[PDB]
């Protein structure tokens, strides 16, 4: 609920904005052989542990 | 002095104002540039005319 | 698991949890619409309660 009209009306969040399970940032998109995919880039702590 | 303090914190600030057509965009966007809003002040005179 | 593990007392025993079991709790549903209608601040409500 955002506000209530004196008319007796109701203003929901869905009535002013799309609610969508999205991502934190859309800057990063990964593709394996073209096919959409994700992944994990693993770095190395200074002090391997080879 | 509170009014002065607040006026400083309001008129001398650095705000984040996103990008023109950042991520995510609509399909076919050809323009992506950052947006500048209020920046910090740099001289005596600038604080002078607050 | 705790039920099946008590059916093999010939190679396993004293099968039990170590934590705690579910206990009754008191749910207080704060109707937001009525809270706005009556003209009370939700912050006031939660603060008073806690």
Curated annotation (Swiss-Prot), chain C:
It is found in: Cell inner membrane. It comes from the Bacteria. Disruption phenotype: Loss of susceptibility to contact-dependent growth inhibition (CDI); inhibiting cells still contact the target. Disulfide bonds: none annotated. Induction: Positively regulated by MarA, Rob and SoxS transcriptional regulators (at protein level). Homotrimer, with large domains that extend into the periplasm, interacts with AcrA and TolC. AcrA may be required to stably link this protein and TolC. Interacts with AcrZ. Part of the AcrA-AcrB-AcrZ-TolC efflux pump. AcrA-AcrB-AcrZ-TolC is a drug efflux protein complex with broad substrate specificity that uses the proton motive force to export substrates. Belongs to the resistance-nodulation-cell division (RND) (TC 2.A.6) family. This is Multidrug efflux pump subunit AcrB. It comes from Escherichia coli (strain K12). The chain holds residues 702 to 751 of 1049 of the full protein.
């Amino acid at each position: 609920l955002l506000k209530v009209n004196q008319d007796g009306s109701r203003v929901l969040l869905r009535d002013v904005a799309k609610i969508e399970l999205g991502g934190e940032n859309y800057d990063i998109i990964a593709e394996f052989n073209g096919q959409p995919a994700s992944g994990l880039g693993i770095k190395l702590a200074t002090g391997a542990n080879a | 002095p509170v009014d002065v303090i607040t006026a400083i914190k309001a008129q001398n600030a650095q705000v984040a104002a996103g990008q023109l057509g950042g991520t995510p965009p609509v399909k076919g966007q050809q323009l992506n540039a950052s947006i500048i809003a209020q920046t910090r002040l740099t001289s005596t005179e600038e604080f002078g005319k607050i | 698991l705790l039920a099946e593990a008590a059916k093999h007392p010939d190679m396993l025993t004293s099968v039990r949890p170590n934590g705690l079991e579910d206990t009754p709790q008191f749910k207080i549903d704060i109707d937001q619409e009525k809270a706005q209608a009556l003209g009370v601040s939700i912050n006031d409500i939660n603060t008073t309660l806690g």
